[PDB]
Amino acid sequence: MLPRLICINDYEQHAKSVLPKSIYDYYRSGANDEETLADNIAAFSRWKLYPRMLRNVAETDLSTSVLGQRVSMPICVGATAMQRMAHVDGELATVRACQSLGTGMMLSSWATSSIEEVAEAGPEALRWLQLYIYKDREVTKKLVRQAEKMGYKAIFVTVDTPYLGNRLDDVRNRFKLPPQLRMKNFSTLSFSPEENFGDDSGLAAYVAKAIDPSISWEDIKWLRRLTSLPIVAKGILRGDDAREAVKHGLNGILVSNHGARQLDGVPATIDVLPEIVEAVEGKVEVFLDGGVRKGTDVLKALALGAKAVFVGRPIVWGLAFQGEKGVQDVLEILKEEFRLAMALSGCQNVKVIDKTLVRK
Amino acid sequence: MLPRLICINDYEQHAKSVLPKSIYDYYRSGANDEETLADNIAAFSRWKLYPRMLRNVAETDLSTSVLGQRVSMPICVGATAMQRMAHVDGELATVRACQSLGTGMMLSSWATSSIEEVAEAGPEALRWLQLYIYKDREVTKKLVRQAEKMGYKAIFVTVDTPYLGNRLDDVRNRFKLPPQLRMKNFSTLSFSPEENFGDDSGLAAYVAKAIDPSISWEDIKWLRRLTSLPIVAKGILRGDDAREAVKHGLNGILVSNHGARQLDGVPATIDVLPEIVEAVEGKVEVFLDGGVRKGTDVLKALALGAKAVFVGRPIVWGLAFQGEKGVQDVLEILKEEFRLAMALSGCQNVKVIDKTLVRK
Amino acid sequence: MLPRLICINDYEQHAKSVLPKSIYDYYRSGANDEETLADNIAAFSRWKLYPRMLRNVAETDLSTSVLGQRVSMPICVGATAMQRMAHVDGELATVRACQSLGTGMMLSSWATSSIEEVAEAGPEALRWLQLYIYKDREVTKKLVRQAEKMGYKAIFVTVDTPYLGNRLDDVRNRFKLPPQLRMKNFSTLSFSPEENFGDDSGLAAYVAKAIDPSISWEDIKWLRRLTSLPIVAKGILRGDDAREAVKHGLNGILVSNHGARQLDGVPATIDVLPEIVEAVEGKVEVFLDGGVRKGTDVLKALALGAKAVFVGRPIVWGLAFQGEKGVQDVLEILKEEFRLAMALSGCQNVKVIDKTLVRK
Amino acid sequence: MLPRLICINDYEQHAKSVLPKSIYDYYRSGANDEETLADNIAAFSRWKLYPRMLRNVAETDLSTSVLGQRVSMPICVGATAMQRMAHVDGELATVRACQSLGTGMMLSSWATSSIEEVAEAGPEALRWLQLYIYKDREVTKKLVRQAEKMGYKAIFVTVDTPYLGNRLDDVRNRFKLPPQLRMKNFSTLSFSPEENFGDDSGLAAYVAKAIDPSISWEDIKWLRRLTSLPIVAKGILRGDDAREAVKHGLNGILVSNHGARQLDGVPATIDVLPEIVEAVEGKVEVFLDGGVRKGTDVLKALALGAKAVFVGRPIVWGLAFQGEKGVQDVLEILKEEFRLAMALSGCQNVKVIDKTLVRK
Ligand SMILES: Cc1cc2nc3c(=O)[nH]c(=O)nc-3n(C[C@H](O)[C@H](O)[C@H](O)COP(=O)(O)O)c2cc1C
Ligand SMILES: Cc1cc2nc3c(=O)[nH]c(=O)nc-3n(C[C@H](O)[C@H](O)[C@H](O)COP(=O)(O)O)c2cc1C
Ligand SMILES: Cc1cc2nc3c(=O)[nH]c(=O)nc-3n(C[C@H](O)[C@H](O)[C@H](O)COP(=O)(O)O)c2cc1C
Ligand SMILES: Cc1cc2nc3c(=O)[nH]c(=O)nc-3n(C[C@H](O)[C@H](O)[C@H](O)COP(=O)(O)O)c2cc1C
Ligand SMILES: O=C([O-])c1nnsc1Sc1ccc(Cl)cc1
Ligand SMILES: O=C([O-])c1nnsc1Sc1ccc(Cl)cc1
Ligand SMILES: O=C([O-])c1nnsc1Sc1ccc(Cl)cc1
Numbered sequence A, B, C, D: 001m002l003p004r005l006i007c008i009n010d011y012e013q014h015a016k017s018v019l020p021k022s023i024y025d026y027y028r029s030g031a032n033d034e035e036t037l038a039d040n041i042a043a044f045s046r047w048k049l050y051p052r053m054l055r056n057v058a059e060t061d062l063s064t065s066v067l068g069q070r071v072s073m074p075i076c077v078g079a080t081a082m083q084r085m086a087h088v089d090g091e092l093a094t095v096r097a098c099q100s101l102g103t104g105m106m107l108s109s110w111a112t113s114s115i116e117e118v119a120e121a122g123p124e125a126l127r128w129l130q131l132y133i134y135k136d137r138e139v140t141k142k143l144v145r146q147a148e149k150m151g152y153k154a155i156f157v158t159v160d161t162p163y164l165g166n167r168l169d170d171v172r173n174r175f176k177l178p179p180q181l182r183m184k185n186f187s188t189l190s191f192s193p194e195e196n197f198g199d200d201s202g203l204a205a206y207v208a209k210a211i212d213p214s215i216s217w218e219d220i221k222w223l224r225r226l227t228s229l230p231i232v233a234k235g236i237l238r239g240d241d242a243r244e245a246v247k248h249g250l251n252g253i254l255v256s257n258h259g260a261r262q263l264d265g266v267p268a269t270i271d272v273l274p275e276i277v278e279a280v281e282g283k284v285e286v287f288l289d290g291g292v293r294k295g296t297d298v299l300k301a302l303a304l305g306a307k308a309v310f311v312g313r314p315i316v317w318g319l320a321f322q323g324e325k326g327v328q329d330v331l332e333i334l335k336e337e338f339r340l341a342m343a344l345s346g347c348q349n350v351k352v353i354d355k356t357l358v359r360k
């Protein structure tokens, strides 16, 4: 046949058909027995919608803002590493699609494109940097300074990866970068497949060499002093940690279990979102990622108090289909599904999406 | 073999075997991942029956009334569009079967038979019109006036379809009317497969051109002033909306998720029915559709306070089997299953079907 | 292979392999979609055991009493019709096995052996009669008088079958007695396969002609006056009905959903048992049937207050394997499994099986 | 292929591929329908983890103590009988691996190696004896005295096996020791496959001849007087029994359902653990076995108050793969998974693993 891909799941199925197994598995995988991976999706199904009828939904407006910057929809691209494994244009394709859509891209720290290259490809795109605190704080500071210089509008500091999760397929497949690719923002720090990264997942060994497992809230204080950019804590799952992030002067929480790729057996993000929204008392924006595949997922997250959601894997499946055009397709599908879900539930804009729309 | 069809599921299986895939899929489909479609049936299974013994059930009486009109049983035909796709006689077959059974038919607004043709075929049948408020209010008013003139006894205004739900199979199949058929109560308004209805579901584009997504409770006020016929709000899932319908002088609520074909992830109708019954405080009759396949489904709905239920898909499967005779068969099966369920639970008539008969 | 049957499920599997489909299906079937049939077994699995350690279980005593008559174990044979369809010796085989085991047999009213024949085969066996109130009360009275004369020790009046449940396989199979067999306690009343019993289940038509659907508590008063034998109401699922049975001077409740063959969607018997035990306030013995397959099922029922349980289908599978010897095997397996369950839970006799042994 | 075994489940799959069916089944089996066997694993999945971020996990310390003896990790080898069926070196391989890992081995009473042989093989290993109270108390006392003499540091008295559970596969397979092997701490008491152990499971008959089903708390008093070694009650599932064990001067509870091999339908050990921890009020250490397969299982057990966990079947799968090296592999996998789970949840040592880390 000819691909007729009409929902995000179709893009995944296409991706599985065209990508090398090792690459598909790297993108697909969760940690260990993948309990949380299943739950990120199943949990959305347990939250039921209570639509209002007869509200006038002729002129649905999906626009909102993220950390003070306007976006066309509350659906943004989350950090996924090494996008050139899915399509030759990788992160440059992604940022161009975001520019077209009027939404934001969170650039991953082990991107196969540089901070500068991505800014050059998407100068008008809303762009943020996802950061790890590397053992080498000079590396870390340089990334932040480059993000500042190159027009990025926030730092998302990932806090759930002091070590890499155990993704069994990567170990089985002995996963590594294809030989032509590198992490472009750093030989060892660039994750060269030529370097010695052990006999298991090359990625886990790389993380153990690069990322600082000793970081504490003291290092958050350091990062807060380092930059005036908005900072979002990415990977928070507890209310008490969320309150600590507010106390440290951070500007947002991304409720995330890292796409279920870190600690397996944590709750679904949609299930912990209410706890986190309650804990921060409106003091910072709260975002969600993990398991967003459909317009109704977006609606449910916003009903429970998220400002916006991020999508990880769907973007990679877009790339695998057709680079920039494929990412645009995936974002347009999510946009249209969200528009329809809003309209059928009686919501003419995002400001009227309330907690009475959902019940578990 | 020779078809030996003894329950509603058997009629569906037969229909799948004889109908073109596109047509079967159109009839079968729910929206998106079909979560609500599954739940409309699963939810009935979770409500358990607590039968009373030794009550004298020798003379079971299934008769009741709907909006003041007597019916032989609390089981009525709900609106399903384009019935001539299932059988050459379509809506005329359906109304003749309803006349034979002594129950009512809700005629769909995109029927493949006219309001007048259906009245001529079933002059003695209890008949109601399901209405959409079209952008063209002159079209809308004409339908209501024809229903009045031709002896229809209520208007069911559908309020859950400002836009059509996303039924994936219809998009995959590029669904449209077979070339010989038309919506007979209106070229574009008649959903001619010759007209330009985009490259996706022809139906969704038709709805977007025809149905007014701007309607509000103000338009309900208009409809209430337009006709003295009883008006039922079809597609209500919230208690607050139900109370608003009562406040606007409507005469009934049809608790409906549109056969799970509109917003996916809403609750099953049997699960929201108690909320709606409580909210209206006996001021109007409350009806249910969605997932009724068996006599015990009918019993459970009445135990939870519905006056009557409507069946959608089962009627189409009856048509696909043998037109009028097939619809009669399906209605007789539901009637007999309901009679048996009543008798085995100790209910000699519908007036003694109480809330103590069920527990979730 | 050679049959090595070590649990009740193995006997069912053997039975399916040797019985004609129509006969196996008749025995196996539940009503309609068989929701309750599945639940009778699943519900036992949800009740968890909390065994006591170090109690001294060297000398486990399984003996108890039923309505004042001693039995070797709280596991008795329930009424299953037409046992000669499973084995040439039918009910005579069953009663001989009960005599050997020291347990009781409930003789079914549409038995393929007479009340007298069964008494002659098992003179020392504890025997009870399961009764329906026939439209012909002279038939009914004669059965009771024969039970009295022939040394039967109780009447179990079945109250959940004013009409037969709808067992789909029987309708599909057009089920009837094999030509050589008859209901031996009555041509039409004997369910002769030569007589006209419609085009569906022959059994349903027979029931409609024979059993009185008009019976009320007034007919229970009649039966109570008719005989001084203990009377048990069989098929009660509600506490209020249980209290009424006590008020009418009956001597026991058999909590039963008729093996899930009557109204589908009623609860599992193990789930309603606590309600019934509470409702009767120790005034009569309470028994259970439905889904008993294992020694732990027996233990759970007794923990929740049943005096004894009855088994239906397992006995038929015993017959299908090897008549009397097969029934003895099934009863011995249940006995040994129950003994082991008692011992492993710290119970040296049935008097110390308490409600703290289980939690749902 | 070449075995690439990276998690405990992989070791089981390998074991199934290389072991004779009878032997694999003996090791694998639970009792009866294996409801508890499934639940021991499923229950761990229902307990969700709530990880703390930014805690400094650069120097994770897994060490703890069991009954006053230091161990490298809270993961110890539980008693599994007849280990020479899995590998020629059996219990000697196991103890050598424990010595290498710095963890403890619980030697089973029907070991295929003597108490002395195991001590000689693992002189520096932490070793405990699992004891049954045999009808012959002289046998029983001799085992305890040998454990004392040979440097064993505790007695685990198993209290849930007055009789053996009914493991259906063992009965189907007519299980017995391979001809070259014996229980080395005792012809009949040595479970010689040459002796008469009935026609079912040889093991059940052996247990019935050897183990005293009459034991009570009075026999616990006897054992407590017999030895000054720490004594742990193994197989407790109720809080009241746990309190009795404390009252009798025992030094620990091993919350255990015997790997789901005794009474089927008891709860999962992880589900009863909180009840037991609460009941003993910190007076003795509480341990868990049953269903531990992953590092997150260990973390969940410790969060709910277990001091350490024991693993049964995983060790046997290690042996089946490669004797001592295979056991070492399995223990190292559990160690590393536990280290990662600790780090990703913010725990730098076992003392900070608290109840707020989990919610059901
Ligand atoms: C293939 C892949 C690579 C990822 N790489 C990173 C990364 O480098 N940094 C990071 O913070 N998160 C990373 N994540 C986590 C994502 O930012 C995000 O939390 C996750 O993809 C959301 O779930 P979803 O894939 O279900 O949409 C990655 C996720 C995936 C699937
Ligand atoms: C094939 C099909 C066509 C339908 N067409 C209409 C329609 O034109 N107008 C409307 O109000 N509802 C329509 N509905 C919704 C039905 O009126 C009803 O809510 C639904 O069929 C009930 O669920 P059931 O099919 O499970 O019985 C349609 C449903 C189906 C299945
Ligand atoms: C094949 C079959 C025939 C039965 N016939 C009768 C009957 O004639 N009278 C009656 O009261 N119950 C009858 N029952 C119901 C049984 O007495 C009993 O309630 C049921 O078998 C218990 O469930 P079990 O089969 O799961 O053990 C029958 C059940 C079966 C399976
Ligand atoms: C093959 C096998 C043999 C066992 N033998 C004994 C035994 O001789 N004594 C004993 O107390 N427990 C014995 N057990 C129970 C174990 O000590 C332990 O409770 C169980 O294996 C824990 O569950 P797991 O296998 O899921 O880790 C045995 C368990 C298995 C699987
Ligand atoms: O979830 C993910 O896959 C990830 N998150 N952070 S790094 C990462 S994958 C990775 C990519 C490159 C290198 Cl060198 C190490 C690890
Ligand atoms: O649930 C359903 O299928 C429906 N409900 N209203 S219209 C409809 S299908 C439809 C039929 C004809 C046309 Cl032109 C558009 C749409
Ligand atoms: O559960 C069951 O199968 C039954 N319960 N009562 S009669 C019956 S089956 C039956 C047997 C014989 C006749 Cl004539 C009619 C019906």
Ligand SMILES: O=C([O-])c1nnsc1Sc1ccc(Cl)cc1
Binding pocket: D081, D082, D110, D161, D183, D190, D191, D202, D203, D204, D206, D207, D258, D261
């Ligand atoms: O769970 C288990 O398998 C066991 N627990 N105690 S003995 C045992 S198995 C057993 C081994 C040897 C003998 Cl002789 C009898 C029984």
